[PDB]
């Protein structure tokens, strides 16, 4: 009943993209957007896109456009949301978030025109000259937004109240030229269907309505009424030529008001379907049906077809700025795009949901172009089926951890970009050498003559040194003072001189030989970085050293005015810095509660925050801080991050430029982490496996990474418990790697595992298949994966049923003809040892056959010590059109170890198919129930028993239309229909009887089903076609159901994305399982069941968080998570809104708890237990 939705992975897969003045009028920015998330990209120079801002929304972006208002310094964005919401937002300086300029709620009962089910999506379009902006609401209304307080009040134009009776609309653009903002509109007054073209040949029309802003009237000019029947999008040709090109599935037109309609055909499928006068384009046979296109300057057009192929159309222009003909050429292929944008002249971004959206570079060939691929953007595509599996190379030091160690494998992408994605949370290190060193609590690694030479361990009474190299060995001679503890030890200069500090004295060093000694309230910590040393005692005294060649450290006692005592320090330099007014900076935190940044050669106050230890979101110039660290991260050490440690709670800041002080401010960034002599916790590392960043030590270790993407990455590390200390380590027997202490006092020489990629929000290995991944199934015995794949071949035959046999008909057409796609399926076998496909192990299916399901079926057997064996079973059936009776085949597979072929270690595993027999009808789903194969053939659900060689039927029921999903636990079969509902079953074992317990009486189109598991409550989690989640329970004693026949929904929640996969894992809460799922728009989510008493303390929080916080784009987090309207029994909490309780400062954190009647000490114990129990994968 009572649950919480939490989001473990943000969604990947960009739908929208443009190129506007987001930050300022000087440079431009790639602004991409996806399912409920907005990104802003810069462009560094090899070229690479750098992330500059990322924004999350409580609503799915349905359209996007950018138009630069009058007098504004930036380019506003026009975000369109679902059921007619427009939202004009801008970037904000000062505070770094989005400032929202306008909202426009247009959801009315009188605008839907009686139609309940909204099918059409809202579409924002803008003027080339920036005069107005239009939204097509519902397909029946146009909303005009006039521009020059910078707006004008809108007015809704009824489309069907115009001339020519618009009806079906296709695409609408604004045209060029045209002193009034002319809006072109494609429409269909009499809609028809491809397949019914003999009574309706072609009905597509164009009206260029000319909009008077002032008079608020609009006359129709320039009508055309006989365009071909299937027209997709229209493109406004730019200013020197003008007009419009109208793509069709089989043709291509150019239309203008004075020029006659020039249009060519592309393939010979406009023979009897199009009576519009069309020419023949020479030597080209393609189709424009899902094609994205943009204009390069003018008279050039890059077209990304389906299949990913890029063409360049040049509009061959005569002297009179008319169009004579078209010219095509086949340039290089690329991703299956969902967007298309020209950036700076020479670049193209290709935003794709499915496949890695990448950036191109084009130069002319010696007007013919060639395309180069710059750095792509990683993308987990439409996650179709995903299976939980175990990794292969976990080290032997970590073998006896009680929690399971496992990872998920995701069928991402589609088609040519079809792939597998090996996703994995917290980093599992490779331990290559371990020690057992008690007593020593700190550690350091310095470079001696760029491998690390010395390992400097600080005990409570003495100091250990280690000599490294070929064979690491403990050092005995002079150099470091080993008579006491050392509080810091680090390189000064440029990896030439070593400096350690003891609480009495401060030693330089050149290696094994001491240079000299400087004596000094014991020293508690030091900041030895960038040829400047600053040493701080326990009473709050600060003194500075400095290398001076003649090299020698020189005391410069800083001029400082201590009205309150300094608690902690940091030092920082700008390789590629924004700190303007390389330059060195001292950061200093006094005990009164303030932060002070100091320019280091002088000591003048440059930056000052008056109330620092609270945790405010954005800082501006003029408790018990533990540790503060400023570090640069990214390309050429560009962007700095501030990291503090205040009352068991880690808060990190960004830095962004904002106009005799520093021209910067610090923006707070969210977390998932709690912190629940002096030892440092924020230990910066440079070049561990190429990755630079921060390791964060404590009860929950977290790797902080920023690569050349510019994106912040937090990766936990939960194996080997809490970690006390850490140091980078580069050796001979250990490569670029790292080095840490266990809590049980065990030093571990370690290397990151090299098969993953830590640049993504989870460490992921993207495995290209170059074919569509449909299903995946981890086989527990022998530890491999079984993937059903498909590839597109051109079709050539047509099956018939002539009463005695099948008779095939050869598709015999013209040589200028595109072929239908016939898909051939094949079952792979993937090895987790190295992720290559295992050779000589591929089951290839029949000529027309389609795998409809693959699961890891645990059938019982007479062989092993248990009953079960865990087979792989595939249900598969033939699609030969509607006039041929569809029959199926059940395919049971067993992966068997054999002797390997010499030179081929991966070939020790091979399929053995126990069962392959054609059934009586299509096989659509499969299951296991106490060792019984449960299959759904047609409108029956059989329950098989596998004997030594064959299946034997035991029981069935007559079920509904098309059961496509089935799951079960403990003889309760759940089912799922395409149109109707779920319908739970039950199987008495003693009599061979299968029975229907209950069913959802309402019609509901289900994607996939799961089992919400509580202590004794078993929920039935269901995702449907409207982007929702719902939990049905079988409650016989209730009276709002009928007696044991109707199911009752108990929790409602509007996830923003479709869901196909479902994983139940135990909990890292007596028997409460987490029902994980991976959303179809890229991300991964959770449902965690709770008790009622914990639930209603957080429902009171969420109602206060919804009202009292300025959400992005003026949205409502309550109405976005209401059921299906984007009869609601909501019981799932918005854990991505409850996660915004952590982001509030502790002054504002306590005001909400006093307004709802509790203390924030309870709510942090309420929230952070949901983060601890959900740290799987």
């Amino acid at each position: 009943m009572y649950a919480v939705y939490k989001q473990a992975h943000p969604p990947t897969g960009l739908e929208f993209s443009m190129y506007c003045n987001f930050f300022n009028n000087s440079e431009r920015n790639l602004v991409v957007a996806g399912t409920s998330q907005l990104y802003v990209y810069r462009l560094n120079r090899r070229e690479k896109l750098e992330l500059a801002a990322s924004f999350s929304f409580f609503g799915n972006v349905m359209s996007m456009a950018s138009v630069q208002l009058a007098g504004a310094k930036r380019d506003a964005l026009l975000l369109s949301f679902k059921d007619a919401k427009l939202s004009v937002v801008e970037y904000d300086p000062g505070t770094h978030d989005l400032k929202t300029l306008s909202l426009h709620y247009f959801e009315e009962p009188e605008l839907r025109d009686g139609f309940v089910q909204n099918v059409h999506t809202p579409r924002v379009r803008v003027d080339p000259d920036g005069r107005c902006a239009a939204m097509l609401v519902y397909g029946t209304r146009l909303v005009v937004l006039p521009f020059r307080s910078s707006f004008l009040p809108s007015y809704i134009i009824d489309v069907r109240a115009l001339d020519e009776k618009l009806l079906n609309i296709i695409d609408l653009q604004f045209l060029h030229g045209y002193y009034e903002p002319t809006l072109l509109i494609l429409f269909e007054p009499n809609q028809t269907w491809p397949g019914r073209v003999a009574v309706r040949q072609d009905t597509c029309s164009i009206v260029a309505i000319s909009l008077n802003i002032t008079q608020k009237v609009h006359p129709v000019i320039w009508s055309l009424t006989s365009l071909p029947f299937d027209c997709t999008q229209a493109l406004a040709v730019p200013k020197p030529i003008g007009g419009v090109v109208v793509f069709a599935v089989n043709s291509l037109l150019y239309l203008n008001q004075s020029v006659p309609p020039y249009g060519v055909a592309l393939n010979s499928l406009t023979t009897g379907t199009t009576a519009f006068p069309l020419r023949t384009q020479e030597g080209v046979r393609i189709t424009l049906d899902c094609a994205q296109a943009t204009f390069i300057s003018y008279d050039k057009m890059v077209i990304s077809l389906k299949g990913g192929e890029i063409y360049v159309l040049t509009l061959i222009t005569d002297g009179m700025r008319s169009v004579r003909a078209f010219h095509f050429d086949k340039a290089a292929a690329s991703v299956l795009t969902t967007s298309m944008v020209t950036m700076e002249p020479g670049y193209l971004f290709l935003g794709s949901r499915l496949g890695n959206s990448l950036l191109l570079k084009y130069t002319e060939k010696l007007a013919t172009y060639s395309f180069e691929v710059c750095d792509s953007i990683l993308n987990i595509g439409p996650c179709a089926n995903a299976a939980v599996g175990e990794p292969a190379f976990l080290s032997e030091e970590f073998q006896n951890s009680p929690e399971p160690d496992l990872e998920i494998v995701v069928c991402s992408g589609h088609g040519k970009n079809g792939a597998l994605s090996v996703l994995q949370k917290s980093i599992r290190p490779q331990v290559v050498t371990t020690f057992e060193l008690p007593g020593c609590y700190d550690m350091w690694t310095v470079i001696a003559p760029r491998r690390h030479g010395f390992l400097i361990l600080s005990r409570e009474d003495s100091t250990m040194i280690l000599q490294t190299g070929q064979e690491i060995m403990e050092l005995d001679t002079s150099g470091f003072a080993t008579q006491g503890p050392t509080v810091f030890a680090g390189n000064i200069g440029d990896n030439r001189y070593i400096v350690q500090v003891s609480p009495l004295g401060i030693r330089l060093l050149e290696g094994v030989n001491q240079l000299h000694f400087i004596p000094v309230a014991p020293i508690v910590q030091c900041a030895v970085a960038d040829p400047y040393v600053v040493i701080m005692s326990a009473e709050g005294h600060v003194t500075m050293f400095l290398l001076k060649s003649d090299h020698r450290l020189a005391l410069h006692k800083p001029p400082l005015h201590h009205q309150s005592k300094v608690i902690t320090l940091c030092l920082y330099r700008d390789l590629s810095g924004m700190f303007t007014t390389p330059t060195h900076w001292c950061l200093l935190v006094r005990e009164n509660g303030t932060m002070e940044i100091y320019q280091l050669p002088d000591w003048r106050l440059v930056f000052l925050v008056k109330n620092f230890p609270v945790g405010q979101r954005v800082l501006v110039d003029s408790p018990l801080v533990k540790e503060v660290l400023l570090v640069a991260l990214g390309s050429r050490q560009s962007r700095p991050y501030l990291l503090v440690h205040v009352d068991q709670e880690l808060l990190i800041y960004e830095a962004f430029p904002h106009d005799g002080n520093l021209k910067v401010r610090f923006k707070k960034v969210p977390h998932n982490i709690n912190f629940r002599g002096r030892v440092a916790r924020f230990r910066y590392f440079e070049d561990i496996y190429g990755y630079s960043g921060v390791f964060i030590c404590g009860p929950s270790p977290h790797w902080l990474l920023v690569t050349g993407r510019g994106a912040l990455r937090l990766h936990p590390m939960a194996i080997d418990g809490p970690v006390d200390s850490f140091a980078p380590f580069h050796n001979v027997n250990c490569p670029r790697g790292f080095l840490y202490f266990n809590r049980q006092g065990e030093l571990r020489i370690s290397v990151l595992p090299a098969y993953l990629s830590y640049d993504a929000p989870w460490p992921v290995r993207k495995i290209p298949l170059r074919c569509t991944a449909h299903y995946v199934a981890y086989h527990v015995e022998s530890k491999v994966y079984a993937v059903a794949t498909s590839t597109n071949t051109p079709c050539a035959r047509i099956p018939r049923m002539t009463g005695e046999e099948k008779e095939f008909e050869t598709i015999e057409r013209d040589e200028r003809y595109i072929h239908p796609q016939q898909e051939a399926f094949s079952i792979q076998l993937i090895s987790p040892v190295s992720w290559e496909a295992i050779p000589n192990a591929r089951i290839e299916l029949q000529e027309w056959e389609h795998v409809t399901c693959m699961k890891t079926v645990s059938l019982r057997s007479e062989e092993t010590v248990s009953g079960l064996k865990g087979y792989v079973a595939a249900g598969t059936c033939l699609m030969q059109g509607e006039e041929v009776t569809c029959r199926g085949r059940i395919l049971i597979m067993d992966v068997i170890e054999v002797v390997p072929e010499p030179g081929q270690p991966l070939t020790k595993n091979k399929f053995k198919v126990l069962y392959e027999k054609e059934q009586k009808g299509p096989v659509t789903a499969l299951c296991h129930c106490n060792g019984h194969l449960v299959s759904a053939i047609g409108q029956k659900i059989f329950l098989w028993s596998l004997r030594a060689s064959e299946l034997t039927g035991m029981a069935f029921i007559d079920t509904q239309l098309y059961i496509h999903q089935m799951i079960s636990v403990k003889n309760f079969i759940l089912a799922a229909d395409v149109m109707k509902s779920i319908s739970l079953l039950r199987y008495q074992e003693e009599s061979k009887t299968l029975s229907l317990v209950s069913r959802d009486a309402k019609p509901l189109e289900v994607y996939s089903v799961d089992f919400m598991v509580d202590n004794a409550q078993l929920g039935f989690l269901v995702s449907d076609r409207d982007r929702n989640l719902m939990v049905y329970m079988y409650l016989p004693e209730a009276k709002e159901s009928f007696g044991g026949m109707r199911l009752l929904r108990r929790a409602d929640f509007h996830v923003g994305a479709h869901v196909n996969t479902f994983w139940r894992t135990p909990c890292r809460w007596e028997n409460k399982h987490i029902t994980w799922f991976a959303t179809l728009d890229g991300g991964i989510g959770l449902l965690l069941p709770m008790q009622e008493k914990t639930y209603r303390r957080l429902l009171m929080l969420q109602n206060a968080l919804t009202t009292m916080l300025p959400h992005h784009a003026g949205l409502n987090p309550r109405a976005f998570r209401m059921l299906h309207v984007d009869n609601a029994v909501r019981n799932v909490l918005d854990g991505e809104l409850l996660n915004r309780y952590l982001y509030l400062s502790t002054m504002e954190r306590s005001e909400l708890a006093k307004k709802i009647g509790t203390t924030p000490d309870i709510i942090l114990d309420d929230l952070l237990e949901t983060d601890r129990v959900t740290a799987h994968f």
Binding site: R196, A198, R200, P382, E882, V884, V978
Partner: protein, 363 residues
């Protein structure tokens, strides 16, 4: 000879993953080789011109040759029961339409036939006045007598509790389901009533008539009082139907017209539906495409309509022989059946891609 819906649903579940919409859908091209790209009408949700079912399939005729009145699908789509004039239920197969079984339900011409909102029960009336319940295995369960004259149409509540029978004596009597108890009588109608549709949420009962003074009467099943009166047609409303959304009232009559009405606004009138050259005797709303419906004629004109277009989308003039009494779409909105005043019953499916529609029904 078969029309199998399985290779369209399997194609739909494979497109569902990487299609997010219909604007993303790879277009079917008008050719005889793109037969695998057909999706059911859940797939192409806009472009409802999909399910304008003008491809002939099969004439289901009996051996007894009796004129049929009601034809309804089993709610799993598995088989077609057919109500003829001899009281016989001839059960037609749902894919390969050959024959399954024949019953003899009533002693009269069967006039009404409804399935419940689950697959449990089936209400049937007849020309004598008897109302029987029927389980999904076509077993005869408790019968009674509802009217002393011929019942014409039944339909019922948004639950399985309470049905309404309209008859030729002029009363719409509201019944309890389990008790078989006549709860109340809705009198004051003017003449015999020939159709009743229950509202899918709000609990309304809308009745037709032959009377010109009180042609359409709204009702109230709890109070029993007539809520409002609609004066829509000149004569003899044959059918009255409602959507599944509950905003619209569709009404067919003998004045060659079909008319939409918003039940929230009765004083005005929505669009009218001409084109039936003879009387318009039957209406079947489409299940998944809200706003498009087939239409029968007394001469045999089978037409397809859509809410928003003034002319029809396109149908079959003079092509279905006889007078059409009732129509029933499959639970997937892809095939259609019609019940003739002839001794036959014909099945209509969607046109194939790329075919030349040159047969005796289209051109």
């Amino acid at each position: 000879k078969t029309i199998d819906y399985n290779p369209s649903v399997i194609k739909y579940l494979e497109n569902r993953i990487w299609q997010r919409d219909q604007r993303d859908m790879r277009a079917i091209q008008p050719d005889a080789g793109y037969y695998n790209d057909l999706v059911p009408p859940i797939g192409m949700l806009n472009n409802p011109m999909n399910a304008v079912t003008t491809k002939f399939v099969r004439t289901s005729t009996n051996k007894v040759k009796c004129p049929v009145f009601v034809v309804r699908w089993t709610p799993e789509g598995r088989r077609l029961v057919t109500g003829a004039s001899s009281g016989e239920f001839t059960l037609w197969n749902g894919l390969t339409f050959n024959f399954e079984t024949i019953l003899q339900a009533h002693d009269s011409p069967v006039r009404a036939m409804t399935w419940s909102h689950n697959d449990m029960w089936m209400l049937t009336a007849d020309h004598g006045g008897y109302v029987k319940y029927w389980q999904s295995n076509m077993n005869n369960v408790k019968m009674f007598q509802a009217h002393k004259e011929a019942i014409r149409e039944a339909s019922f509540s948004p639950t399985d509790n309470k049905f309404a029978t309209c008859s030729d004596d002029g009363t719409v009597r509201i019944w309890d389901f389990l008790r078989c108890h006549e709860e109340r009588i809705l009198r004051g109608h003017g003449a015999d009533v020939k159709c009743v549709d229950w509202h899918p949420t709000k609990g309304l009962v809308v009745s037709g008539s032959k009377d010109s003074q009180q042609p359409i009467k709204f009702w109230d099943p709890k109070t029993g009082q007539s809520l409002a009166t609609l004066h829509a047609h000149k004569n003899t409303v044959m059918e009255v139907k409602l959507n599944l959304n509950g905003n619209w009232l569709l009404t067919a009559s003998r004045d060659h017209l079909c008319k939409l009405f918003d039940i929230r606004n009765l004083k005005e009138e929505l669009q009218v539906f001409r084109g039936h050259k003879k009387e318009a005797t039957a209406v079947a709303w489409h299940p998944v495409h809200e706003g498009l419906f087939a239409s029968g004629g007394s001469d045999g004109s089978l037409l397809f309509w859509h809410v928003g277009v003034e002319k029809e989308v396109g149908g079959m003039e003079m092509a279905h022989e006889g007078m059409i009494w009732s129509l029933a779409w499959h639970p997937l909105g892809h095939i259609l059946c019609s019940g003739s005043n002839d001794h036959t019953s014909k099945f209509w499916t969607r046109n194939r891609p790329g075919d030349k529609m040159r047969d005796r029904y289209n051109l």
